[PDB]
Chains A and B, each alone.
With several copies, the nearest count.
Chain A
């Protein structure tokens, strides 16, 4: 019979159990008063990665707490970022969250994280 016409092959190459940070009016006031570039470190903690500085104000303001529980592996992953931060920026994260600005490094870690597990007015 006739051949079959074999064609060629070619090489072709977070809104958990809390109130939103925009609904928590004091935190919304801080997020409106600070320059957007302050928020990067917070969004890094909130999502384990900071997004665009264009969306960053939305990304922090729309957050309503972690869905998780304290002591869990995700909480430990939040402690990793907070322990890798430094006390001045941790006290700024306290200030914009309306948290009091005192504490040793490990207290700043646990106190910020206990709040961001359940952020409320």
Chain B
């Protein structure tokens, strides 16, 4: 009489938990009522962004011949990508250091 419980996530084809998002939205009193598709869409968005970051960072890792992502590879990924750097420009990433930038003038001739 009871259909096999499958998480809304599965219904959506996402890795991020939709139900968790939903719960947070209602626990955040963002509005008295939260539509059903809102947590789905939101989860999808977050998932996408995460995917993007992790892709770039891992790329940068293969460039350091490093198999495992550490905070520097995130800093590199982000700052080297203009779109994210705009998104995360006010953000300081602990243990991230800086993007190597020696101003042209400073180099001797």
Contacts and interface: CB of A to CB of B under 8 A. Distances in A.
A and B touch in the complex (CB under 8 A): yes
Interface of A: 3, 5-10, 12-13
A52 B79 CA distance: 47
Interface residues of B, number: 12
B103 A8 contact: no
20 contacts: A3-B52, A3-B83, A5-B56, A5-B81, A6-B82, A6-B83, A7-B80, A7-B81, A7-B82, A8-B79, A8-B80, A8-B81, A8-B82, A8-B85, A9-B82, A12-B103, A12-B104, A13-B103, A13-B104, A13-B105
Contacts of A10: 101
Contacts, number: 22
- Tell me what chain B mostly uses at the interface: helix, strand, loop, or mixed: helix
Interface of B: 52, 56, 79-83, 85, 101, 103-105
Nearest to A2: B55
Nearest to A9: B82
A7 B101 CA distance: 14
Given A8-B79, A8-B81, A12-B104, 12 more contacts: A3-B83, A5-B56, A5-B81, A6-B81, A6-B83, A7-B80, A7-B82, A8-B80, A8-B85, A10-B101, A13-B104, A13-B105
